[PDB]
Design a protein around this ligand. Structure first.
Ligand SMILES: Cc1cc2nc3c(=O)[nH]c(=O)nc-3n(C[C@H](O)[C@H](O)[C@H](O)COP(=O)(O)O)c2cc1C
Ligand SMILES: Cc1cc2nc3c(=O)[nH]c(=O)nc-3n(C[C@H](O)[C@H](O)[C@H](O)COP(=O)(O)O)c2cc1C
Ligand SMILES: O=C(O)c1cccnc1
Ligand SMILES: O=C(O)c1cccnc1
Lengths: 191, 191
């Protein structure tokens, strides 16, 4: 069921490269995003999908140095990210947001918020789709630190605002324990 | 598959009250939220689930008047919402957000954003879960207009910030046509 699928999605930090079908994975990622809803069907999400050489480059040449060259003013956490099969960088196209604000100024204040919600939406739908394939993932946030260098290396338009980075790969160790709130404190039903 | 489930979720405006098992529906809604990820497992989402009398009250006594008593300074759109089986109001608990900002001030700026993303996440997971049950839904945003009156009528804590309202019920007419972007304009793959 769909509920079971949601349940199978978890944060997996121990990731490897035991991935059997790269293309199938890529297609699944696109689909998860394609069939995700967005305000006005604006489809503001953008993805950079890195595997192999680019995966190593992101973490060894970009994240790590900018992290270390910042602390001044890490591993083997970074080693754990690099060791994964790939990283999916989620952006939101600010250009579309601005246009929407102009075309429909009645909702100018909303589009930014709906865009943010849209990033959460596609991020978890990809995350869950990958879990269904038996692949694990975890979501990182080294934005805005690495924004500039990522755009430069992969020639991304300036309008792509980085929101998060979903590291993914083969599951090499199970998710940890997780707790839940009391239902009574977050659900109210009235008839 | 999970992809199929995502695909089955659509915006349905023609809704009715041909719902067979209210309790099963309620349980499904809770589960969709329960198994949704949130930053720091903060679980900031809160739901008010209205059916029957409360459903009618929301749209007839709250939304409509405040909408009309605002325009001065509608139907049968509102009639279409009221005609549905219920409305799920999604809130984000600002109290938890603030505490997080204090406990982890290193991420003070993030929690607000992660909270917003969290609302999108649980909203679409509920939306999709309902679709799997054969029920349709559409997402409305009469916040912040109706915030105050909703809190008053159902004695909600002030800390619950309303984010959206998902009207749901039996599908009485199919979704309209929808277009998609060119893949080339929103997906970049590098290896
Ligand atoms: C964050 C968000 C906000 C939305 N706001 C509204 C709204 O206020 N009123 C409405 O009727 N639909 C709203 N929509 C529905 C979208 O227009 C719809 O999901 C999109 O056009 C794709 O169509 P689909 O839901 O049938 O897949 C919203 C969707 C999202 C994800
Ligand atoms: C919007 C959002 C932001 C998150 N930020 C991070 C992060 O920066 N680093 C990290 O390791 N996990 C992050 N998480 C993972 C959550 O802590 C995790 O989903 C939550 O504890 C529930 O655990 P689960 O993913 O195994 O279900 C984030 C999750 C969400 C939904
Ligand atoms: O198309 C939408 O998503 C929409 C419709 C009405 C109001 N706000 C957004
Ligand atoms: O637990 C989280 O979600 C988390 C972990 C590290 C950094 N930011 C968030």
């Amino acid at each position: 069921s769909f509920i079971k699928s949601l349940e199978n999605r978890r944060t997996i930090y121990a990731l490897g490269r035991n991935v059997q079908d790269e293309e199938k994975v890529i297609e699944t990622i696109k689909e998860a995003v394609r069939f995700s809803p967005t305000a006005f069907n604006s489809q503001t999400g953008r993805l950079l999908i890195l595997t192999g050489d680019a995966q190593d480059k992101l973490w060894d040449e970009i994240v790590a140095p900018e992290l270390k060259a910042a602390m001044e003013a890490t591993r083997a956490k970074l080693d754990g990210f690099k060791a994964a099969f790939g990283t999916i960088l989620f952006f939101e196209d600010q250009a579309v947001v601005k246009n929407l604000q102009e075309q429909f100024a009645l909702y100018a204040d909303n589009f930014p918020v709906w865009s943010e919600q849209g990033s959460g939406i596609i991020s978890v739908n990809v995350w869950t789709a990958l879990a269904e394939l038996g692949l694990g993932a975890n979501l990182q946030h080294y934005n805005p630190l690495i924004d500039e260098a990522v755009a430069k290396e992969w020639n991304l338009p300036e309008s792509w605002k980085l929101r998060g980075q979903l590291v993914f790969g083969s599951i090499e160790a199970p998710a940890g324990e997780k707790t839940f709130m009391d239902d009574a404190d977050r659900f109210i039903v009235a008839k």
